[PDB]
Amino acid sequence: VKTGIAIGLNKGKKVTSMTPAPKISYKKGAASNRTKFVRSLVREIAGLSPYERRLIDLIRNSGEKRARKVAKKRLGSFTRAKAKVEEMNNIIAASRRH
Template identity: 50%
Template sequence: MEGVHRQPGLASSSILFNFRPWAVTFSARLSIFSSSTSANHQERTTFSADFAARITITSLNQLLPRATKSLPSAKLLLLRLVWGVNRGYQTERRVLAPRPSNRKGREGERVKVIRSVVREVAGFAPYERRAMELIRNSKDKRARKFIKRRVGTLRRAKNKMETLTNVIAEQRRAGH
C-alpha cells in the first residue's frame, strides 16, 4: 500500500497513514477496532470513519499550525481535510445582485401592451382561426400538426397552441 508504513513502537493493529494530496500533509494514527489509550500520550478521538475505525491524534503540535491551536481538534481536522464531502476551507456563499443578462428575452410591460393592442386591432391570422376551431372541437393533435406546418418547428407550434388555448379560455370566461 502506497503511503502506509508501520512505525516502530506501535501496536500491530495501528498503522500510520500519511496523506499528502496537494501539498497538505495530514498524519494520523489509525487504530482499527481498538480504543486503548496510552499513558504517555493524550490521545483525542476526532471522528469515526465509514469502516468503523477511529482516527486518533497523538500530537496536535506537529500536525496543526500555532494560530489554530485554540479551536477544538475536531473542527481543526475538518478545516484541514482535503477529501470527502466537507473538504477544503469552509466559506459562506456571497449574495449577488441579479445580472441584467439573466432577464434577456423576458417580455417587458411596454412590449406586452403594444402586442395586446395589435392583437385587438388586427385580430387573428386565418391559420390561427382554423387552429382555434380545431382546438374547440377537441382535435388538439391535429391542430398541433397543422400549426407546425405553418410556423416551422414543434417548439413554436407548442407555444402557439398554448397561446391559442389561453385565448379560447379567456373568451369562454368573458362569455363570447
C-alpha cells in the same frame, strides 16, 4: 459542488465555487410595463391570422393532437406549435367563456 477526482458525476477539483453577480444580458426577453401593454393592444387591433383561425377551428373540432400536428407544419418547430396552440387555448378561454 464537485467531488475532487477526475472521473464520475461532479468531477473534479474542489475550489471556492462562490460566486458571480447576475448579468443584465440574461433577462434579454423580459415581458415588461411596455411590451405587455403594446402586444395586448395590437392583438385588439387586429386580426388573428388565417392559420390562427384554422387552429381555433381545429381545437374546438378535434381538440389538440391535430391543432399541434397542423400548427407544426404551419410554424417550423414542435416547441413553437406547442406555445402557439397554448396561446390559442388561452384566447379561446378569454373570449368564448362567460
